[PDB]
């Protein structure tokens, strides 16, 4: 963790066009779906990260899916043959890419034998080898997979016997566990022998929006999942093969999009995200229309683009109540916008209890740091209540608590960098995804730093 001193947004540019990096969640799914699909797909706007880099090399190794890059590595070309994969004999090294290991574990259960090997080995580093993966291994074994823990019980490394495939039919999966286990099974379900009924048991899953994103992406690749008539969390997946589209563009990250949009809202300037609109797979795409618009912003949104122009500085309106369940990651951004919407009514955000168990307690972190700016705030039973003030923010002193703590949480720091820009003197962010945001502050918004 490092330090960054954000200078006031003294005279921002009038208009600004920002294309955020691609979504991580969408990037990771697209590579699995393309590897299993039939046809050659050019994947654009992929987010390069631990998952994708390890995923890319893992798919490269398996026989039956070919990976290459074009246009200076910005285009990933995947040619699938319809999911007829065979072992290379190479151990697939996944580092500590948690999502890749969950997705690839079920892919490996589909792989056929070769003369080099009768199995697929999935490995990773020491942190990988402490990650629990039991609930997924249990469900695949229950469906005919043969999986051996090669080191510690319940984690990678895994040896998955090839040539077995998945029986299909009913697969039961506990609902308390990561949605990434559900998603991992959904994407491989069409390749089971028998059509799959994926029934979550033991309660309601928490990250339902990410299950829905997997289903919608599956539909883009030619396979429509259907929900049960009597069970909200039972999914019926046809047997089939994905049809790879000629091109698939990874949506830019709509959560990251909220920070430049909030900048425009908060400075009385204009920001356009030219490739994120109302047809987005991501709930956070609704931030502009469901948060910034009621708060006094002039907002236009087409199916694929979003433009936000804030009201004059100091003129944001409090949003008396907003349910941010469809977009919980954007509540930190909503909170700093609300901090300068003078009331009147407070801004009350509910539906974000799940946001209390992330890197830090983000609700608690937001209340405590807001106090440092002179912004009253308090927790609600289901969220947060912000008592916005005039842009008479507390003037910042040097080397005497000018530090805003980010609690090692990426989003907390980016949110408070916006509020920092509205103060009368520079503000230092302490204990500081999207490294380019700090670059974009200086290159696009032309904000001085350090
Ligand atoms: O499938 C995905 O891409 C994601 C599902 C969620 O995981 P959990 O269901 O474990 O919360 C989310 O927290 C994570 O950031 C990404």
Author numbering: 387 to 818, 824 to 841
Sentences from the paper on this structure:
In Fungi and Apicomplexa, the second to the sixth steps of the shikimate pathway are supported by five enzymatic domains combined in a single protein known as Aro1 or AroM. Our activity and in cellulo data suggest that only four of Aro1’s enzymatic domains are functional and essential for viability of C. albicans, whereas the 3-dehydroquinate dehydratase (DHQase) domain is inactive because of active site substitutions.
The structure of Aro1EPSPS is composed of two distinct subdomains (I and II) connected by a hinge region. Because the Aro1EPSPS fragment was crystallised in the presence of shikimate-3-phosphate, we identified additional electron density corresponding to a molecule of this substrate in the cleft between the two subdomains. The lobes of EPSPS enzymes are known to transition from open to closed states upon substrate binding and our analysis confirmed that Aro1EPSPS-shikimate-3-phosphate complex structure adopted the closed conformation. The interactions with shikimate-3-phosphate in the Aro1EPSPS structure were primarily localised to subdomain II. The equivalent residues have been implicated in catalysis of single-domain EPSPS enzymes as well as in the corresponding domain of C. thermophilum AroM. Introduction of the H796A mutation in this domain had a less severe effect, with Aro1 retaining ∼20% of EPSPS activity relative to the wild-type protein.
